[PDB]
Symmetry: C3
Subunit: 438 residues, 3 copies
């Protein structure tokens, strides 16, 4: 019982590929520190094929021969939802394509043996589809589910209050005519739960954000996840969320999702405070892994409240796919950051930073557009064009605002090699971005 003993992980370049169609699963960690995957193994993706629920353990850098969790002739298990409970017990749940029923299995010996604990009858609904990383909400452990009944769609929670012994439908997140389905739920503390959902086929470039402040009792539709630069009308699927906090305690939410139009799995972040206030405020997207064709379905494990270990599935062909792992390096996430905003010469900009104390560090950068591929660091410089002129900006910091004073040129002097070597690099207008760290 040495809680000080650390078991590190290295997922860089790791993969589970055996020429099957392995997909739609979750990665999590065992009590002993070993990473594992619970997923659907089959030889096709079409509904009614040979899907079975399996478990694989990462040992010595190699994924072990999968253990069969659930299998039945004539039955096609679909997505595999689940994860590790606080008790160390593992939960794996999957919907049977042919019946639309959800079957729940658990393991108390780190994946060696599995026991069937529950089967959710569809009842009046066309089906109940299990999908996503399970999570804890108070004394309840939850398995996310989405269902449909004709033209009606719903987002539900399959919960257990006795450690996974008994289950039953719990909170209802959504019920309407909008095809919300794959949804990630992230408990972010004391009653608050954030959710991001895929919209129908995923086409449209949007992911929907919802939030509850009472452990799922009630929900508010916050609108589409919004950032300065989005994803056009691209197909976005299988969102997943992670919680982390900065070097000094500031909480942030990390969103992973797969864009099947650009063929990349990306992540974006947002200050938790901003996420609670609304769906805007997300940061720019960062590619975490290539995602060809029907790839995606991400999951994560967070270490030390700051180190994200991730997994996604990628196709090698229309009938073969594997699990590929990675790590996300967030660096020091800003406590405050502006989007790119237009600036002009010899002007004053006042930005409310909204921080608990004055930021000890500030960075100001310049770009020629609000969606730049490159940008420059802004520092108070000088140039002479017949008269004495300042270039860049001077900065003032206080407990309320960060104020910037621009020179005759918002950036550029013409005196530095390659990137600022001509009179024409002296720009009177453009865009600035301010980042501040407490």
């Amino acid at each position: 019982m040495n809680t000080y003993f650390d078991i590190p992980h290295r997922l860089v370049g790791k993969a589970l590929y055996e020429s099957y169609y392995d997909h739609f699963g979750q990665m999590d960690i065992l009590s002993d520190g070993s990473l594992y995957l619970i997923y659907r193994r089959a030889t096709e993706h079409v509904g009614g094929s040979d899907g079975r629920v399996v478990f694989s353990k990462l040992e010595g850098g190699i994924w072990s021969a999968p253990t069969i969790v659930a299998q039945a002739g004539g039955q096609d298990f679909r997505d595999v939802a689940g994860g590790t409970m606080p008790s160390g017990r593992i939960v794996a749940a999957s919907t049977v394509y042919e019946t639309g029923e959800v079957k729940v299995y658990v393991s108390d010996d780190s994946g060696v043996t599995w026991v069937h604990k529950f089967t959710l009858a569809r009842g009046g609904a066309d089906y109940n589809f299990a999908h996503g990383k399970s999570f804890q909400v108070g004394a309840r452990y939850v398995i996310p589910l989405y269902a449909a009944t004709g033209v009606n769609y719903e987002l539900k929670w399959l919960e257990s209050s006795d450690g996974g012994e008994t289950w039953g439908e719990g909170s209802t997140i959504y019920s309407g005519n909008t095809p919300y389905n794959e949804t990630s739920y992230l408990p972010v503390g004391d009653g608050v739960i954030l959710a991001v959902a895929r919209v129908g086929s995923g086409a449209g470039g949007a992911l929907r954000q919802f939030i509850s402040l009472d452990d799922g009792g009630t929900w508010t539709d916050q609108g589409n996840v919004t950032a300065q630069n989005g994803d056009s009308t691209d197909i976005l699927v299988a969102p997943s969320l992670s919680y982390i906090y900065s070097e000094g305690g500031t909480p942030h939410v990390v969103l992973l999702y797969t864009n099947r139009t650009t063929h990349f799995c990306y992540y974006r972040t947002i200050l938790l405070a901003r996420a609670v206030a609304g769906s805007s405020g997300w940061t720019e997207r960062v590619p975490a892994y290539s995602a060809p064709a029907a790839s995606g379905y991400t999951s994560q494990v967070v270490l030390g409240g700051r180190r994200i270990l991730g997994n996604l599935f990628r196709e090698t062909s229309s009938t073969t796919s594997g699990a590929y792992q990675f790590e996300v390096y967030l660096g020091g996430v800003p406590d405050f950051e502006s989007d790119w905003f237009s600036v002009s010469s010899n002007s004053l900009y006042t930005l409310s930073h909204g921080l608990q104390r004055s930021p000890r560090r500030v960075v100001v950068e310049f770009a020629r557009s609000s969606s730049p591929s490159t940008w420059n660091i802004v520092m108070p410089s000088y140039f002479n064009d017949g008269g004495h002129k300042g270039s860049g900006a001077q900065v003032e910091v206080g407990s309320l605002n960060i104020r910037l004073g621009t020179g005759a040129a918002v950036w550029g002097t013409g005196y530095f090699g390659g990137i600022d070597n001509s009179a024409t690099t002296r720009l009177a207008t453009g865009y600035y971005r301010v980042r501040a760290w407490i």
Copy 2:
């Protein structure tokens, strides 16, 4: 037993208020991750009223109906000291106003049931007053107490070496004619314990700092907590301390206290190395929460060695009060920082940074006073007033010192909008503050 399972917390805007006079308690965390409060509930604050010791658990973002820990007709329980032991057992101790006796209660089922374990007779002392967050010192768990006998005052420790089964007076921190009372003790590692105490009524703007290097065997009076800018002669009460360490391991101490003159609960920090050396070196105060009238009495829980969760009590009227929670965002605390010091033109400043290695990051800021509301970032600039002159400062870094070379103006050029737009913003003197991060 999944030590990897994380239970996050969000205390922003949270409060426990039911129109009672709830006050003088402690917030801590249960082994299962749930936050709780142990405090005095009553319908008045005066001595001899109806104080009872109660316990409340934060579930789904709402504080539960309080469980009665200790109650007796005719007896008025005062401050509630205590917290969670390493074993998971909860300790709650309170002094009976009428008798001056300290009663200790414990719970092994996360606050569901409570058992009376000890009663400290006052003996020759006028009374023994329990107050503060309990803590571990080696194999001993301690409950802080302050007492008085006529004109004599003492700071004592009520300890247990068997997990809270038996108790007895232990180390004596102070004994003299100075009314030291409410005292926070912070074990900071291997024999060293830091203490900050309220002085009498709290008037005078000072908090006293003490330190022990032998687990409380002996103590040294380090003097009043000192920073460049203090709290005038304001009333300061109920200090509380927390231990945290930076992104690379540097330890710092965080002090929370309530100023009843300005009506704010503030926090300050200090490098542990500096705190061990003396009472000077504390950073500027940062308001954590409003504290009207007789508010205060802070407590904290630290996550990941860097995320402070806090609580304080606030009055809504002279006879009603509640518990209000918050979070402290420390950001990246500097490994070295100077106070504001006077600077002049075309001069050289040499600052010993005292770091284990040369700092990789340095920030230099400028202000017109040593207690500024706003300041500017200092960067090597230029201006022409008939002659060629430098503005700001150039920086040299080494394994021993940070050296700064100032221009004809310590700051200002007159070429930037709003904050540096006139010849008069070119200043030859002022104050600089240097911050460095390893």
Copy 3:
């Protein structure tokens, strides 16, 4: 079972010295948070003296009277290898000088009682020498050993798969004519194990780096540990390694070693990604502690994945020595950093940062050599020598590179006090170092 209860540590200035020749041991932490030392106590260092294996616990800032782990008249125990297992059990192993046999002892009550579990016969080898911090690799716990047979040398692993009940020789790291001996092994995650070894007497200024990607099944000789500025041909001994990760999850390896030529114990770091790619990329050395004469033999304990607690042994005379503890303050380790590289005026430098996303922070520094004692921060400035010229560099950041544009002077203006106060401080050439943080 309160995993939230934190036990801090403070090793600054701490030492275990009782006028014996205490040396060649390991420091680790108990499940209850107490630090301990397992080492060789004797009254001489020569082979065949009175070495016995002992255990000391740090309580209240003072090392306890050593408990005898292993002792036998006529037998001289040498180096003491071992540490704390995931189970909380302590392992201590030492080679008997007279027989060349390795004896393994374990304790299940935090060092109170010890039980002999195994004795490794030398067989055909001249001897098997236990040395270093033990570690976990999958389901195996390992004790590092080095051996020799005539002119043949080998690096071996003594492992147990049942929690230390039974042992046996396992993986073979090296076997050849090179005298590799004292070797530190660091599991860095899922199959990868890094190793750094002392070469013979240690003379030559080199430490050898090896790496395995299959839990020790196979090994690759990566060459000598390489940095821009090494250790000449100095005597380097007893390397030790630690694993840590940044504020946002970036992994780094920390190497401690003792230089008996300069008489200092130093540490260097390296991005794990770089260490996996090869033996180059290590950072500059930082002195952690003086190491007079035959001092050295470092060990560490890491808290919060970022706080290194260390120990080494130091001689006070040729026949007396003690254990001295310390702490390493890493600060924010750069995600990318260049060595010092030559720069010239009005030029453009393009540096591939190799980061997962564009770095949010960049620092550029200037020095007159690639092994400077001091350096300056580079910021876009200006000066006039009859014509308009830029000084320093402008910076461009993108998702692939960091680009720098230099002025007529790579640094210097002649307008700032002390360090940049003459026309001669305007330099057209020199060296730059770029550091970037995600």
